[PDB]
Scaffold this motif. Structure first.
Motif, short mmCIF file in Angstrom:
data_model
loop_
_atom_site.label_atom_id
_atom_site.label_comp_id
_atom_site.label_asym_id
_atom_site.label_seq_id
_atom_site.Cartn_x
_atom_site.Cartn_y
_atom_site.Cartn_z
N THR A 1 1.84 2.67 1.18
CA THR A 1 1.21 3.84 1.75
C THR A 1 0.69 4.73 0.63
N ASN A 2 0.02 5.81 1.02
CA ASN A 2 -0.33 6.86 0.08
C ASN A 2 0.94 7.54 -0.41
N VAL A 3 0.90 8.00 -1.66
CA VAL A 3 1.99 8.81 -2.18
C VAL A 3 1.98 10.16 -1.47
N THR B 1 -6.82 14.74 -1.03
CA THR B 1 -8.23 15.11 -1.01
C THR B 1 -9.06 13.89 -0.63
N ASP B 2 -9.87 14.02 0.42
CA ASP B 2 -10.63 12.89 0.91
C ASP B 2 -11.77 12.50 -0.02
N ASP B 3 -12.27 13.43 -0.83
CA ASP B 3 -13.33 13.09 -1.77
C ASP B 3 -12.78 12.32 -2.96
N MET B 4 -11.67 12.77 -3.53
CA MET B 4 -11.02 12.08 -4.63
C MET B 4 -10.10 10.99 -4.09
N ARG B 5 -9.32 10.38 -4.98
CA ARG B 5 -8.37 9.35 -4.60
C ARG B 5 -7.04 9.61 -5.28
N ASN C 1 -3.22 -2.80 9.69
CA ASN C 1 -2.17 -2.81 8.68
C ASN C 1 -2.78 -2.71 7.28
N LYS C 2 -1.95 -2.29 6.33
CA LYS C 2 -2.38 -2.09 4.95
C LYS C 2 -1.33 -2.72 4.03
N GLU C 3 -1.53 -3.99 3.72
CA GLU C 3 -0.63 -4.74 2.86
C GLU C 3 -1.32 -5.07 1.55
N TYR C 4 -0.64 -4.82 0.44
CA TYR C 4 -1.23 -5.02 -0.87
C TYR C 4 -0.52 -6.17 -1.58
N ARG C 5 -0.98 -6.46 -2.79
CA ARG C 5 -0.31 -7.41 -3.66
C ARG C 5 -0.60 -7.02 -5.10
#
Ligand SMILES: *[C@@H]1O[C@H](CO)[C@@H](O[C@@H]2O[C@H](CO)[C@@H](O[C@@H]3O[C@H](CO[C@H]4O[C@H](CO[C@H]5O[C@H](CO)[C@@H](O)[C@H](O)[C@@H]5O)[C@@H](O)[C@H](O[C@H]5O[C@H](CO)[C@@H](O)[C@H](O)[C@@H]5O)[C@@H]4O)[C@@H](O)[C@H](O[C@H]4O[C@H](CO)[C@@H](O)[C@H](O)[C@@H]4O[C@H]4O[C@H](CO)[C@@H](O)[C@H](O)[C@@H]4O[C@H]4O[C@H](CO)[C@@H](O)[C@H](O)[C@@H]4O)[C@@H]3O)[C@H](O)[C@H]2NC(C)=O)[C@H](O)[C@H]1NC(C)=O
Ligand SMILES: *[C@@H]1O[C@H](CO)[C@@H](O[C@@H]2O[C@H](CO)[C@@H](O[C@@H]3O[C@H](CO[C@H]4O[C@H](CO)[C@@H](O)[C@H](O)[C@@H]4O)[C@@H](O)[C@H](O[C@H]4O[C@H](CO)[C@@H](O)[C@H](O)[C@@H]4O)[C@@H]3O)[C@H](O)[C@H]2NC(C)=O)[C@H](O)[C@H]1NC(C)=O
Ligand SMILES: *[C@@H]1O[C@H](CO)[C@@H](O[C@@H]2O[C@H](CO)[C@@H](O[C@@H]3O[C@H](CO)[C@@H](O)[C@H](O[C@H]4O[C@H](CO)[C@@H](O)[C@H](O)[C@@H]4O)[C@@H]3O)[C@H](O)[C@H]2NC(C)=O)[C@H](O)[C@H]1NC(C)=O
Ligand SMILES: *[C@@H]1O[C@H](CO)[C@@H](O[C@@H]2O[C@H](CO)[C@@H](O[C@@H]3O[C@H](CO)[C@@H](O)[C@H](O[C@H]4O[C@H](CO)[C@@H](O)[C@H](O)[C@@H]4O)[C@@H]3O)[C@H](O)[C@H]2NC(C)=O)[C@H](O)[C@H]1NC(C)=O
Ligand SMILES: *[C@@H]1O[C@H](CO)[C@@H](O[C@@H]2O[C@H](CO)[C@@H](O[C@@H]3O[C@H](CO)[C@@H](O)[C@H](O)[C@@H]3O)[C@H](O)[C@H]2NC(C)=O)[C@H](O)[C@H]1NC(C)=O
Ligand SMILES: *[C@@H]1O[C@H](CO)[C@@H](O[C@@H]2O[C@H](CO)[C@@H](O)[C@H](O)[C@H]2NC(C)=O)[C@H](O)[C@H]1NC(C)=O
Ligand SMILES: *[C@@H]1O[C@H](CO)[C@@H](O[C@@H]2O[C@H](CO)[C@@H](O)[C@H](O)[C@H]2NC(C)=O)[C@H](O)[C@H]1NC(C)=O
Ligand SMILES: *[C@@H]1O[C@H](CO)[C@@H](O[C@@H]2O[C@H](CO)[C@@H](O)[C@H](O)[C@H]2NC(C)=O)[C@H](O)[C@H]1NC(C)=O
Ligand SMILES: *[C@@H]1O[C@H](CO)[C@@H](O[C@@H]2O[C@H](CO)[C@@H](O)[C@H](O)[C@H]2NC(C)=O)[C@H](O)[C@H]1NC(C)=O
Ligand SMILES: *[C@@H]1O[C@H](CO)[C@@H](O[C@@H]2O[C@H](CO)[C@@H](O)[C@H](O)[C@H]2NC(C)=O)[C@H](O)[C@H]1NC(C)=O
Ligand SMILES: *[C@@H]1O[C@H](CO)[C@@H](O[C@@H]2O[C@H](CO)[C@@H](O)[C@H](O)[C@H]2NC(C)=O)[C@H](O)[C@H]1NC(C)=O
Ligand code: NAG
Ligand code: NAG
Ligand code: NAG
Ligand code: NAG
Lengths: 128, 348, 105, 132, 128
Positions: free
Chosen positions: B49-51, B56-60, B96-100
């Protein structure tokens, strides 16, 4: 052997951007730089730039900056370390850019510099 | 031992023993990874997930908080454990949001041992018997051709081995003025080494306070991850002095006009493009790898007639040093605010 | 949330969630039947009209609760207190904190 | 010296557009920010939001659609319009001036700071009640 | 550096048992022995015993046997091998034993014996 395989010749419109690939095989791809050169009728050759595929460090000609771009993709397997892919994305297309393009590699001798390009691809014709 | 009436021709570019230093440091770097832990059970499905941060939606956000299945020390029981990573180490696999991890398809990443550190120590390369080492003590020696005042020595002077792409750190300062060196000036495929006289102080820091957390992979296997970020989520950065940077760029302009005539307009622009660590300047501030933006430095023009430049950085944990085909390396997080003072000595 | 301290003594009123990063608290008070009124607008800064002894916890502490320190209390300080934290990690609080009431002997 | 004064109907039929007005005294509408805050009985206040000239009109994202803040430079007043009065909307409402200020914690150029709000003076209230 | 961290001073009742910890850091903990010593006002120093933390092999002073006990716990990870914890459990408490206690380590030089204790903890006051 040292083999440089280009793509086929392509026909584009003015204002588009042509992507030309250059696959190299038969040597250690991470060691030798890749130059790009052009051939225009009644203009002779004109230099474009070089790219070292070890990191992707590039250098462009001064009069073509803002229009060209160079990337590379390495071969990541312990079985085929020799082959590699270089790219050239040429943007800002005018009808003056109708020419034959080459992606070249220098020789491997000791007194061989960088610009005496020994091995040449078969050439790609771009007509606008 | 200072010699008399002697002159030998030197060449830094066709020289030996720089290749030997490169091979020795690469092989010795590889040799400090065999006792350490391979991250074989770590290339796994990561629920990220996000920390927790004011988004801010413009930045990341540069931190993703990932929980995942991990094997315990016991082979039957598995646990759910979470950690923090950067954007530059994970990728989305395809709601879903699964990373690797980014290195899941090239190599297992040997975790660096947290016992061993990466600070430089001076190595002296000594020659065996029957061989000698000659050092040229001429001031205005551009590293090619006959040097008039050489002296033999049994071992070389202190070489702190730095890992610095642009803006080489902790080097040997020049004698009295800036010296540019190249194999062939009209060759633009040959790099130009600029070594100047007075050093430029550069400060670098990560102000984010991190928490080392241990996870038990198996018997005698410990994985060191990021825990909580104690305080504000800030961007790690570096500082140089504005006035000394402008002065030293004036010095290298004054020296660069000797090779191209006086009526020459010299401008400094940033790197053109490539990978991360050849366009931005990368270094290692005590076991932590910074990738700092140098657009704020090479942004000038020069005609032939209290402030401080801050520059942001990115922080990666997994590295692909020397770009080997199957050799990546995780770096463990380190505690507390991390700052380092170094001296920019030259340019490439 | 009922805190009572016989007058002239000290007083510690806590409010709101525990801190995450840097914060900018705002303390308001509310007499019964009246409008609200500012007493503290920063971590430890007060405007004119409100006297001293209404000290605040500094926002540089990581992982604590916002407090409101009052010494030498009186019948005028008998009111409903409210906090409005502005954390640099949590989002913007469009609602205030929890009502903490002070009552005196 | 400033003091504010609201006005409203007081009795509201449900599913009706509620509208409130807010007078000034001394300081005009151009010289300062403005804000509306609502509060039910025996509850903590709910800051509805703030209004200013040049786009500084950010609203509470909980409501975000059924509330519209406005100014009156011709008559020098503040105004608010609501939509769809429900039973929870029975509250005392406040117009009040507020001041900004930068809390800075890191680098200024990397946007490592923020702007907090605080209401210095207040109005007096309008006991809005929804009933049939 | 060589650091010896004790616990804080403690107040006990007669007939109880006080456990005093001694965390050592900055050297290889398994190599050097740990001694315990006491300091009583109007009595000077008085020896208690030693323990080698490599195995836990102990030796006690003769007049304190039956009352004292020494254990240790090692650091089992390949990342932090330096630190270690020693213990001393002193039982049979009387009001005579109100004193300041020290856990000490010898020096590291070649002619350094065992009893010339170079490194000392900050001391722990025990009042009965
Ligand atoms: C590389 O270079 C870059 C840039 O080149 C560096 O980046 C810089 O990094 C530093 C540190 O990381 C940053 O400093 C922070 O600055 C902010 C902003 O400070 C300014 O504003 C403050 C408040 O403004 C009010 O006063 C001014 C008058 O000064 C007035 O004009 C304004 O309108 C407003 O009314 C000023 O106080 C402050 O001045 C201070 O600094 C001057 C420098 O020389 C000095 O002369 C002054 O005397 C004064 O000391 C400045 O103008 C600060 O807010 C911030 O400090 C707060 O936050 C940190 C972290 O949370 C905390 O540790 C601090 O203690 C402090 O928190 C206190 O202050 C809050 C203010 O309300 C308060 O709410 C807190 O609760 C807390 O209050 C407690 O202490 C105070 C006393 O301090 C007490 O009154 C309270 O009751 C309570 O007890 C940092 O200082 C830079 O902004 C940043 N950027 C730039 C462009 O410089 C980078 O660091 C470099 N890296 C390296 C490695 O070199
Ligand atoms: C160019 O050259 C300069 C000059 O040496 C380098 O600057 C040094 O860099 C090293 C590595 O980053 C720094 O060493 C680390 O310092 C941390 C800060 O502590 C300092 O201050 C305390 C109090 O005075 C001293 O006790 C301590 O010795 C340091 O001087 C320490 O926290 C670090 O210690 C941690 O790691 C070591 C690793 O073995 C452990 O043994 C420790 O127990 C502890 O866990 C570490 O010592 C050093 O401080 C820097 N010097 C200065 C003057 O700043 C530059 O780093 C170099 N450039 C590059 C790119 O490397
Ligand atoms: C947490 O992060 C959020 C960001 O998602 C942040 O919300 C923003 O707050 C500011 C003020 O607190 C809002 O107002 C802005 O203020 C600046 C400063 O004057 C103005 O320049 C802005 O105007 C621009 O943007 C408007 C649209 O929003 C345009 O209409 C205008 O023409 C300008 O282009 C603006 O008024 C800002 O709107 C919000 N962000 C959003 C997306 O609403 C919040 O403050 C942060 N909280 C904390 C505690 O840090
Ligand atoms: C290294 O540092 C440099 C600067 O030190 C950094 O360059 C900046 O990058 C951003 C994006 O990568 C550039 O683009 C901006 O992005 C925002 C995002 O919304 C836009 O809004 C900006 O537009 C504004 O500015 C325009 C020109 O003034 C206006 O026309 C427009 O209406 C907006 O006001 C803008 O496009 C940004 O321009 C550069 N900065 C400079 C000075 O060029 C660089 O990215 C860093 N390197 C790396 C690898 O990240
Ligand atoms: C060298 O300096 C130039 C000058 O700014 C840098 O060019 C800038 O590059 C960024 C990307 O790194 C461009 O940002 C753009 O953002 C939009 C937002 O979505 C995105 O759609 C684009 O694809 C791009 O990411 C920015 O426009 C561009 N600016 C200019 C004037 O060209 C360049 O990156 C610097 N090089 C290095 C290595 O730092
Ligand atoms: C990352 O996500 C984890 C969840 O997997 C967070 O851990 C939880 O945090 C909440 C908030 O305090 C607690 O109520 C839970 O008990 C926590 N669960 C566990 C298993 O620890 C964690 O706080 C997140 N980290 C960050 C930096 O955002
Ligand atoms: C969580 O992270 C996701 C990204 O995986 C965010 O989704 C997008 O984020 C970008 C920049 O952060 C925004 O420009 C997009 O508008 C976002 N998409 C959507 C549909 O909103 C997402 O915003 C983050 N936050 C939450 C609460 O999910
Ligand atoms: C950790 O392991 C658990 C157990 O397998 C995973 O939970 C399963 O997730 C799938 C997909 O969402 C569900 O269909 C199953 O019902 C879940 N089972 C249980 C027992 O929860 C989980 O996804 C893994 N990862 C994390 C981050 O918890
Ligand atoms: C480095 O200095 C040497 C001289 O010490 C230069 O070598 C001579 O350069 C001149 C041109 O200025 C030639 O005519 C000579 O033939 C060169 N001699 C030799 C032995 O090479 C050299 O050009 C300098 N290089 C740079 C990059 O400045
Ligand atoms: C980073 O966070 C740690 C907390 O994990 C800070 O350590 C604390 O420091 C305070 C006083 O400085 C002590 O009272 C606490 O006991 C410490 N806690 C721990 C767990 O060590 C540390 O100081 C922080 N770093 C900075 C630079 O503030
Ligand atoms: C880089 O860091 C050094 C400290 O390591 C800074 O030097 C200090 O500068 C202040 C004034 O700004 C002096 O009061 C201190 O005495 C200095 N200390 C030391 C140890 O030099 C230096 O200013 C920093 N440079 C920048 C550009 O931020
Ligand atoms: C590994 O995965 C990434 C992400 O899709 C991809 O870009 C890269 O080419 C892959 N590498 C190999 C060797 O397949
Ligand atoms: C440039 O000017 C300097 C004077 O400082 C002179 O010594 C040098 O010869 C000049 N170079 C050229 C190429 O004219
Ligand atoms: C280059 O300098 C100009 C003026 O000093 C500045 O506006 C610009 O931001 C700089 N370039 C970059 C990429 O930051
Ligand atoms: C291993 O487990 C035993 C039994 O609980 C425990 O006494 C010992 O301290 C553990 N060792 C480590 C290194 O955690």
């Amino acid at each position: 052997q040292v083999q440089l395989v280009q793509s086929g010749a392509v026909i584009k419109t003015p204002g588009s951007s042509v992507k030309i690939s250059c696959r190299a095989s038969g040597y250690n791809f991470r060691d030798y730089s890749i130059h790009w050169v052009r051939l225009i009728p009644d203009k002779g050759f004109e230099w474009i730039g070089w790219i070292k595929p070890l990191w992707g460090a590039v250098s462009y000609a001064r009069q073509l900056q803002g229009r060209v771009s160079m990337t590379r993709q390495l071969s990541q397997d312990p079985d085929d370390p020799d082959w590699g892919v270089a790219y050239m994305e040429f943007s800002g297309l005018t009808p003056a850019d109708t020419a034959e393009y080459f992606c070249v590699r220098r020789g491997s001798c000791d007194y061989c510099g960088d610009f005496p390009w020994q091995y040449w691809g078969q050439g790609t014709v771009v007509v606008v | 031992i200072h010699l008399e009436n002697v002159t030998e021709e030197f060449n830094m570019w066709k020289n030996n023993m720089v290749e030997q230093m490169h091979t020795d440091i690469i092989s010795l770097w590889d040799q400090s990874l065999k006792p350490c832990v391979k991250l074989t059970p770590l290339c796994v499905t990561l629920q990220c997930t996000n920390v927790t941060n004011n988004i801010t939606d413009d930045m990341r956000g540069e931190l993703k908080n990932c929980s995942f299945n991990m094997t315990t020390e016991l082979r039957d029981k598995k646990q759910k454990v979470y950690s923090l990573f950067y954007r530059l180490d994970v990728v989305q696999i395809n709601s879903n949001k699964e990373y690797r991890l980014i290195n899941c398809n090239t190599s297992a990443c040997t975790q660096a041992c947290p016992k061993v550190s990466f600070e430089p120590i001076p190595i002296h390369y000594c020659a065996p018997a029957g061989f000698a080492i000659l050092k040229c003590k001429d001031k205005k020696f551009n590293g090619t051709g006959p040097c008039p005042s050489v002296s033999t020595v049994q071992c070389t002077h202190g070489i702190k081995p730095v890992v610095s792409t642009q803006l080489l750190l902790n080097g040997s300062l020049a004698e009295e003025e800036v010296m540019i060196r190249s194999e062939n000036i009209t060759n633009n495929a040959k790099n130009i080494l600029v070594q100047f006289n007075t050093p430029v102080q550069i400060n670098c820091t990560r102000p984010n306070n991190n928490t080392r957390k241990s996870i038990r992979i198996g018997p005698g296997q410990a994985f060191y991850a990021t825990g909580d970020i104690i305080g504000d989520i800030r961007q790690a950065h570096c500082n140089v002095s504005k006035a000394t940077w402008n002065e030293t760029l004036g010095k290298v302009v004054k020296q660069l006009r000797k090779h191209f005539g006086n009526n020459t307009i010299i401008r400094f622009a940033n790197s053109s493009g490539g990978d991360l660590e050849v366009t931005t300047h990368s270094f290692n501030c005590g076991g932590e790898f910074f990738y700092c933006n140098t657009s704020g430095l090479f942004n000038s023009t020069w005609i032939s007639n209290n402030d401080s430049i801050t520059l942001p950085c990115r922080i990666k944990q997994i590295i692909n040093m020397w770009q080997r085909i199957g050799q990546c390396m995780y770096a463990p997080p380190i505690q507390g605010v991390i700052r380092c003072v170094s001296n920019i000595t030259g340019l490439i | 949330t009922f805190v009572s301290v016989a007058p002239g003594q000290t007083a510690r009123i806590t409010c709101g969630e525990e801190s995450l990063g840097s914060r900018s608290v705002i303390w308001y008070q509310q007499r019964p039947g009246q409008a609200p009124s500012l007493i503290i607008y920063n971590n430890n800064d007060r405007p004119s009209g409100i006297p001293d002894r209404f000290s605040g916890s500094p926002g540089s502490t990581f992982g604590t609760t916002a407090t409101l320190t009052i010494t030498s209390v009186e019948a005028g300080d008998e009111a409903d207190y409210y906090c409005h934290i502005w954390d640099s990690r949590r989002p913007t609080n469009w609602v205030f904190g929890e009502g903490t009431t002070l009552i005196v002997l | 010296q400033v003091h504010l004064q609201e006005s409203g109907p007081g009795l509201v039929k449900p599913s009706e557009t509620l509208s409130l007005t807010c007078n000034v005294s001394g300081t005009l509408v151009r010289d300062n920010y403005w804000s509306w805050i609502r509060q039910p009985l025996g509850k903590q206040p709910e800051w509805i939001g703030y209004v200013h000239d040049s786009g500084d009109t950010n609203y509470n994202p909980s409501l975000k659609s059924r509330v519209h803040l406005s100014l009156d430079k011709s008559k020098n007043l503040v105004s608010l319009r609501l939509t769809g009065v429900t039973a929870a909307d029975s509250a005392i409402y406040y117009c009040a001036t507020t001041k900004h200020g930068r809390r800075i914690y890191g680098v200024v150029a990397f946007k490592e700071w923020f702007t907090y709000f605080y209401m210095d003076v207040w109005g007096k209230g309008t006991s809005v009640t929804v009933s049939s």
